[PDB]
Design a protein around this ligand. Sequence first.
Ligand SMILES: *[C@H](C)[C@H]1/C(=C/c2[nH]c(/C=C3N=C(/C=C4\NC(=O)C(CC)=C4C)C(C)=C\3CCC(=O)O)c(CCC(=O)O)c2C)NC(=O)[C@@H]1C
Ligand SMILES: CCC1=C(C)/C(=C/C2=NC(=C\c3[nH]c(/C=C4\NC(=O)[C@H](C)[C@H]4CC)c(C)c3CCC(=O)O)/C(CCC(=O)O)=C2C)NC1=O
Ligand SMILES: CCC1=C(C)/C(=C/C2=NC(=C\c3[nH]c(/C=C4\NC(=O)[C@H](C)[C@H]4CC)c(C)c3CCC(=O)O)/C(CCC(=O)O)=C2C)NC1=O
Ligand SMILES: CCC1=C(C)/C(=C/C2=NC(=C\c3[nH]c(/C=C4\NC(=O)[C@H](C)[C@H]4CC)c(C)c3CCC(=O)O)/C(CCC(=O)O)=C2C)NC1=O
Ligand SMILES: CCC1=C(C)/C(=C/C2=NC(=C\c3[nH]c(/C=C4\NC(=O)[C@H](C)[C@H]4CC)c(C)c3CCC(=O)O)/C(CCC(=O)O)=C2C)NC1=O
Ligand SMILES: CCC1=C(C)/C(=C/C2=NC(=C\c3[nH]c(/C=C4\NC(=O)[C@H](C)[C@H]4CC)c(C)c3CCC(=O)O)/C(CCC(=O)O)=C2C)NC1=O
Ligand SMILES: CCC1=C(C)/C(=C/C2=NC(=C\c3[nH]c(/C=C4\NC(=O)[C@H](C)[C@H]4CC)c(C)c3CCC(=O)O)/C(CCC(=O)O)=C2C)NC1=O
Ligand SMILES: CCC1=C(C)/C(=C/C2=NC(=C\c3[nH]c(/C=C4\NC(=O)[C@H](C)[C@H]4CC)c(C)c3CCC(=O)O)/C(CCC(=O)O)=C2C)NC1=O
Ligand SMILES: CCC1=C(C)/C(=C/C2=NC(=C\c3[nH]c(/C=C4\NC(=O)[C@H](C)[C@H]4CC)c(C)c3CCC(=O)O)/C(CCC(=O)O)=C2C)NC1=O
Lengths: 65, 65, 160, 160, 160, 160, 160, 161, 161, 160, 161
Amino acid sequence: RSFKVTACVPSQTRIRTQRELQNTYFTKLVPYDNWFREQQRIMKMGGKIVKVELATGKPGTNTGL
Amino acid sequence: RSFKVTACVPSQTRIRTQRELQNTYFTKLVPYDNWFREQQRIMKMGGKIVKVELATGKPGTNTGL
Amino acid sequence: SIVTKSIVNADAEARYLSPGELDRIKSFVTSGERRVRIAETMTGARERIIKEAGNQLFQKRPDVVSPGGNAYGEEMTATCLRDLDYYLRLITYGIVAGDVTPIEEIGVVGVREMYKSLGTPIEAVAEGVRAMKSVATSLLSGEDAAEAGAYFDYLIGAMS
Amino acid sequence: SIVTKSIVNADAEARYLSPGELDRIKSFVTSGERRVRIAETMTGARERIIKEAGNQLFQKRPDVVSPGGNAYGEEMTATCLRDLDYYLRLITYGIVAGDVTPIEEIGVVGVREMYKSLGTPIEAVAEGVRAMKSVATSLLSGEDAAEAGAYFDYLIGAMS
Amino acid sequence: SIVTKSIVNADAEARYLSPGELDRIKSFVTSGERRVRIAETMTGARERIIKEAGNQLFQKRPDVVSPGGNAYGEEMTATCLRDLDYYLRLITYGIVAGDVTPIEEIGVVGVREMYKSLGTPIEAVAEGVRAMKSVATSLLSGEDAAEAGAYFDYLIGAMS
Amino acid sequence: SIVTKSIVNADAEARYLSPGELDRIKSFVTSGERRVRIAETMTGARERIIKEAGNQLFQKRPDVVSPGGNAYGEEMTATCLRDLDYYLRLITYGIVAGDVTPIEEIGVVGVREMYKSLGTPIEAVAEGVRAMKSVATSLLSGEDAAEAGAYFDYLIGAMS
Amino acid sequence: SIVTKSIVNADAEARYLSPGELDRIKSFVTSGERRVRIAETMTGARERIIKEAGNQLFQKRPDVVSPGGNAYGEEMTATCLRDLDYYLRLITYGIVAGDVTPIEEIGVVGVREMYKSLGTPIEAVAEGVRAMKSVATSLLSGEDAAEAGAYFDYLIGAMS
Amino acid sequence: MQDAITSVINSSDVQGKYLDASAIQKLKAYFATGELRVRAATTISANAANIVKEAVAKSLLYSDITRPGGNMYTTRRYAACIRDLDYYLRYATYAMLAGDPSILDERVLNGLKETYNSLGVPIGATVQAIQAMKEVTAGLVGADAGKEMGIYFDYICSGLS
Amino acid sequence: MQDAITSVINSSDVQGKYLDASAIQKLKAYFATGELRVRAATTISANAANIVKEAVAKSLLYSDITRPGGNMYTTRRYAACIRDLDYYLRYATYAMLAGDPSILDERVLNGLKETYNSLGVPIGATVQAIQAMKEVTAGLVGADAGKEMGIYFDYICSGLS
Amino acid sequence: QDAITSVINSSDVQGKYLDASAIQKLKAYFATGELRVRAATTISANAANIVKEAVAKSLLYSDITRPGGNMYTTRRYAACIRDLDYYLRYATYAMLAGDPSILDERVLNGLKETYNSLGVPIGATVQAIQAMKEVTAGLVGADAGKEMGIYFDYICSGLS
Amino acid sequence: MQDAITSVINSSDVQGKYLDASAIQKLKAYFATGELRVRAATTISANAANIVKEAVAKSLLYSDITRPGGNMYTTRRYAACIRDLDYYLRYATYAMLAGDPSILDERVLNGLKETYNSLGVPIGATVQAIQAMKEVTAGLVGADAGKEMGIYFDYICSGLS
Ligand SMILES: *[C@H](C)[C@H]1/C(=C/c2[nH]c(/C=C3N=C(/C=C4\NC(=O)C(CC)=C4C)C(C)=C\3CCC(=O)O)c(CCC(=O)O)c2C)NC(=O)[C@@H]1C
Ligand SMILES: CCC1=C(C)/C(=C/C2=NC(=C\c3[nH]c(/C=C4\NC(=O)[C@H](C)[C@H]4CC)c(C)c3CCC(=O)O)/C(CCC(=O)O)=C2C)NC1=O
Ligand SMILES: CCC1=C(C)/C(=C/C2=NC(=C\c3[nH]c(/C=C4\NC(=O)[C@H](C)[C@H]4CC)c(C)c3CCC(=O)O)/C(CCC(=O)O)=C2C)NC1=O
Ligand SMILES: CCC1=C(C)/C(=C/C2=NC(=C\c3[nH]c(/C=C4\NC(=O)[C@H](C)[C@H]4CC)c(C)c3CCC(=O)O)/C(CCC(=O)O)=C2C)NC1=O
Ligand SMILES: CCC1=C(C)/C(=C/C2=NC(=C\c3[nH]c(/C=C4\NC(=O)[C@H](C)[C@H]4CC)c(C)c3CCC(=O)O)/C(CCC(=O)O)=C2C)NC1=O
Ligand SMILES: CCC1=C(C)/C(=C/C2=NC(=C\c3[nH]c(/C=C4\NC(=O)[C@H](C)[C@H]4CC)c(C)c3CCC(=O)O)/C(CCC(=O)O)=C2C)NC1=O
Ligand SMILES: CCC1=C(C)/C(=C/C2=NC(=C\c3[nH]c(/C=C4\NC(=O)[C@H](C)[C@H]4CC)c(C)c3CCC(=O)O)/C(CCC(=O)O)=C2C)NC1=O
Ligand SMILES: CCC1=C(C)/C(=C/C2=NC(=C\c3[nH]c(/C=C4\NC(=O)[C@H](C)[C@H]4CC)c(C)c3CCC(=O)O)/C(CCC(=O)O)=C2C)NC1=O
Ligand SMILES: CCC1=C(C)/C(=C/C2=NC(=C\c3[nH]c(/C=C4\NC(=O)[C@H](C)[C@H]4CC)c(C)c3CCC(=O)O)/C(CCC(=O)O)=C2C)NC1=O
């Protein structure tokens, strides 16, 4: 099972000559067990997430992963 | 089957010199049919519903009044 | 604005809005541009209007700057012209809102006992805004000082 | 099960699965008719196993039987007796599944942080299922006990 | 020591020590002899502390001395008080240091695994440190016992 | 702030607060009244330090108001002393926050490009805050020259 | 175009166009009439340049025209006319652009999986290209044999 | 009971200064949305009956809530359940003309969370009553006209969850 | 992701209680069909390039989609278009060995509704390309195994368009 | 946003300096700041004994949370009570800061829309929170439970 | 990415008929005005550090936002409102030198509209800043190159609307 996250985050410490639109806005597929850590990493830079509906589906199941 | 609520309403209409203190922090028993009108009367009075207690409710029981 | 008064005259009857009230509120918002140009001349010359309309209070009523009067004292006149500034703030909220309801949510109700407790005469500050009426319409043109003069004469109904 | 344990292994290397896996899946289905025989032996024993082994862990460990333990009380001795009903009914899914992928995710993954929050000794339930293992080999005919007893041995070696 | 972790926090950002941290060094040092006589009461009454803490260890959890557990028998209960001796030596270091990093480097960063690989439940250990909390703060005046209580409670929070 | 420097470091290691860090907050709270009143006499002397600072700037660095400088003409120097007012706007909560980091947000992380993009020399505004340094701490007490002058070293060293 | 990847090679470094690169984009436009006429000759003589060169493929590799082959018969070497015409087309698009990105957009990176799904060895096709290079330069001038053949050597290296 | 003209007056009156010149441009942004919301609100108030009937037909009339055993089996609960839905969109048409969700704050968020778990109606099915509502309005009134309706629609359920 | 084996195991724990004899007959119905569906996996693992070669050569190798214009003109848009075909054929072996159509929902059919729409990719070629691909496998694995894989293969058609 | 720093930040959005309409707000933090570290030392010590008693009666024995429903299998119980540390940890990180804006976005970014996609019962996690609110307030005192009254309720009011 | 050289390559290549007299005329439509377009770029390359300060000096040097109390007041985000003007300038001269809005679709305007909402940033001021940049970029490049650059900046602010 996996999620479809999208989120926006800036960087604070520097001004960058490269474009970084894919770095300031995401639409990523992240699995279930990385998401306990991947969500917390955007909190340290303070970026907001918006739409976090799961794409793999089948919620509330017990077995079958 | 009835309700029990407590609420707080101020009156910024007229300066009232007498005691209005059961008028502002009444707790009350209300019956079931009156309350949707009574909350509506509180809402355009500018009140604040702080707690709706339960104990005379027996909720979910769709029959037996 | 009237959009507040349109809803509470529709929510009290628990209905949607009438088409006559719907044309009423969409005619306010086109006039909502026009009141912004009124308030810019008020907020542009807000330093002008008070500092001699308060003098016309002193020409007409010299009791309050005589000793025995409440506003006598240069620290008291400085708060007095601060006090006359405060109603001109309320007027500039009420031009752009278009009704009396921001003045009827901030500064209208306690004025018989706001100044009883401070001991200032209530008719004196009634004549301060009447001087502040005639100064501020003189900074406007003819047709547009009538809409801003509608809420000048609202406040003297409160004080007198 | 042994399908889905192997199917996710074939997908991770992105290929059609091995003929080494084809002798695995063929022997599972052709021995499945005696595999369902092991599950129905646990149907009529589902009160017989748990009545002896919960008292057997109480005599292997009389730490728990005194006031101050963790099963102590008629809702508290019924806590571990019911959780031993769960772990029996857990792995009887995994007899007929033939591998550990039903038991491990809904039984084994979050345990150590749970039992320290629940205050239960992890060493108690580790030797408690060891008491459950020994009577399971007796009522079955040796070899079919030996293929189903390893899932007990998976459950012992994965708590601590 | 606070001079350890105020260096490595300044070394993490490649910076000098800020003067908001230099007064944390200086006020630690001139009040440092206050921390000596606090710790002298611990080593001055360490036999007093270890006697009337282990009795209520077997009163709030009285089943560790019961058979089927770890601390049953004279030698096996003696490893508990051998391990109770190993705790308050570090809190004697923890008072003097100003930071809890001697307790971090010695006695917490493997306790979560090394006790369930030894057979002692942490929820019984966490009672045993807080049983000392009622007696070690009681053996000192409550001004100096407030900050003395502010070190071993971190270990209970690092057990619980 | 000093609380921010602790609870993002303890947030990173997924831990609670060490009591060595907690007494940095406790010593911050007691030293708040000594810290806030430095900013109260900085806010009273707001229109004092900036006046001679340009007189310390323009008598040593006269190239900006010479023809051939960016701060040429009386409109530009009136904004230039206004921009030095912005740095004093920044400083008077640096002795409220306790350390640098609100200056680090709003003062120093774009200053090497923007003053370069606005045609001004970066050393001259770096001179204007270190010429402000001597006429700010001498305008206050003798002990707190190290306290209020501490955050002036960040403003010197980041631009220069 | 020689513009659009000099754009890409200047985009990744986050830089404008260098004047050393700007002569290369200047000299391409003034020599753009020299390459469109040599691309007219490949547009005009496209039928002769494939028909005899296809027999140079089958003279040097007659494995393809053998039965049981990939491209066997009057209808499947017809498909070699329906495939090699695109490579004769795309070299003209490589000439008028100035570089190899019309080659790189159409017929390079998927040909390892194209011809595997077709079942044709790529180096059998590629020696038809290298024999076509030997007969394309029979039409070109002694100056233009290098530069129009410079886009050929990218295609021979892409297949091999 | 506030409006976006009154909101920018009162939020400036916490500071107590005059009209902020950037904040004047918010009223011009309110003027730009003004003449389209009045054409939006007449579309809702005409079709208010069937748009309750359309929003319950998408996800509520054939599910386990009105399949019997739940609270929507009896009709006097169910006619009140429609009646608790008619006051949602009737208070939502006020929200466009107000230009702030404070009209929802003083009235529909006053005690509605504490009364719904008092009776124990399903909160997520009530969310399912209004996420089905939040598309059927925007399909009927216009795409830009449905854009400022959803910002008051999620203000209900986030205030309800 | 679950099979037909842990389908009944997952329904056993939603109902909580141990699986009964009707649930036993649902599990052992796989075991009567297990030894034949692995016989399909023997011959489909061999010639997996052969099935995706001639299915192109049926109606997708001389076509308008292969001639200028189209979506298989260049070799790179070819290089995904054949790359999708064996990915359907590999996961059809993944579906037909497990009894469940739920494996390829989240691994194949997750984004295929809109990624074929946003890229300007004809599904109507690929729906035409798979019904000829479905018929040639049942000739190659035998009609006893080719039928049961087809309802997992026509499950792909319900999620595609 | 670390409530010293937020009223610093509100001053810069106001633009003007630190006025004595906000200087006493700093003194409001410094008044309760001496108890604030002292209230932190209790809850860091009593960290995970709370979540045993928290869920314990709140919903731990609720059958509907053992049979079949979100929080009932082994892996989803210990994943859920993992966050009950992080709900409790950020409750301290709120009250050390004295501020709800370090809490409105770390724990509370998209968790209304995460937990609907997980199928979490919303009000049951509210019902876990509402009287695990009191059990940490019982040890720290109701005078210290008032600042835990606002910040612990800020999550579930933001979650609903 | 699609250059105007490669676009008129592509328009014959989706048809697959060869480059005609009309198709070579589009290259001669590019090569006849090619010389001024290269010489326009060296003026905009040397002046790009210089020209970026007069765009805000004509628009946003003293305004209602850049004071204390609005956006572009941190000096960190004042770097961003110069660097985005550096971003819009450096990508327009790529789009000038290639002659397309397609590079502008791929690089600068692939997600730029959505991110400006949740950052809470004024869009309409940045519309005026590029629109102020037209009259300063046309004073130095000449009149003839000033109008061909104007349609490329106008694709940005229409794309940012
Ligand atoms: C004066 C000692 C130096 C100097 C100043 C100068 N500044 C400007 C114009 C601006 N300066 C800034 C810089 C800041 N503004 C801030 O708010 C802060 C703190 C966050 C800084 C660091 C900005 C943004 C402007 C633009 C106008 C504005 O204030 O918003 C000028 C005018 C230049 C012009 O072209 O108009 C001058 C002269 N220049 C010097 O030579 C001194 C070293
Ligand atoms: C004007 C602002 C305002 C509103 C709207 C309001 C509503 C409100 N809805 C109520 C009940 C109810 N609400 C529902 C709700 C629903 N049924 C469903 O199909 C869905 C799950 C959900 C859709 C909204 C049901 C079934 C009842 C009756 C339950 C009961 O009798 O307790 C009640 C309890 C008394 C009653 O039954 O009327 C009130 C007071 N109060 C207010 O002050
Ligand atoms: C906009 C709504 C609003 C009103 C009306 C308002 C009135 C107001 N008038 C005040 C004082 C005052 N007002 C006056 C007034 C006068 N002195 C004279 O000589 C004249 C007769 C008269 C008018 C010039 C005086 C003298 C005081 C100070 C009280 C005293 O020292 O007696 C004060 C106390 C000072 C302060 O803390 O601000 C308030 C709050 N504040 C508001 O927010
Ligand atoms: C299969 C995964 C799984 C687990 C772990 C589980 C645990 C579980 N343990 C419970 C009680 C309990 N279970 C125990 C367990 C023990 N105490 C002892 O004396 C023994 C040493 C030990 C177990 C062998 C205790 C102490 C409680 C009461 C909670 C407490 O007060 O600590 C309850 C509450 C009663 C109810 O069901 O309504 C649940 C749900 N449920 C599950 O589905
Ligand atoms: C300072 C760093 C440090 C740690 C962490 C440490 C732990 C520690 N505890 C031990 C034993 C022990 N630990 C306990 C624990 C307890 N007694 C009880 O009754 C309570 C439940 C609990 C603590 C309050 C017991 C009963 C033993 C003896 C176990 C045995 O002999 O099998 C042992 C093995 C025997 C020995 O001490 O040599 C170690 C190494 N030793 C150290 O030097
Ligand atoms: C330039 C990019 C490009 C490639 C690679 C391409 C290949 C291509 N080759 C095809 C057929 C074919 N192409 C070949 C080609 C060859 N086999 C031989 O004998 C020769 C060595 C070789 C070429 C001279 C053959 C034999 C077929 C028919 C295969 C069959 O019928 O099974 C088809 C289907 C027919 C059609 O064009 O509609 C395509 C799309 N098309 C393209 O646009
Ligand atoms: C198994 C997991 C998986 C799936 C589901 C998947 C789908 C997938 N198919 C794609 C493209 C494609 N899919 C086709 C499809 C077809 N050709 C046609 O003409 C028909 C309509 C149809 C089949 C005969 C084409 C032509 C492209 C290329 C589109 C392009 O790159 O412009 C792409 C875009 C990137 C790429 O070029 O590969 C994805 C992600 N990829 C994966 O790795
Ligand atoms: C720092 C701010 C913050 C927090 C706290 C946070 C929590 C959080 N709660 C989670 C799951 C969960 N949350 C709950 C909820 C509950 N369990 C109960 O016992 C209660 C009744 C109820 C509330 C505590 C459950 C049951 C799960 C696991 C469900 C699942 O696997 O999806 C997950 C996903 C773990 C997974 O994928 O399985 C995260 C990241 N995220 C954040 O960003
Ligand atoms: C190459 C194409 C491209 C652009 C342009 C781009 C811009 C971009 N602008 C940003 C922020 C920003 N953008 C602006 C924009 C403006 N200032 C205003 O007031 C106006 C509304 C507008 C005129 C320029 C501001 C103020 C910020 C800082 C916002 C913040 O960080 O809170 C950020 C996040 C932080 C950063 O990296 O600076 C990016 C990535 N990214 C890209 O990939």
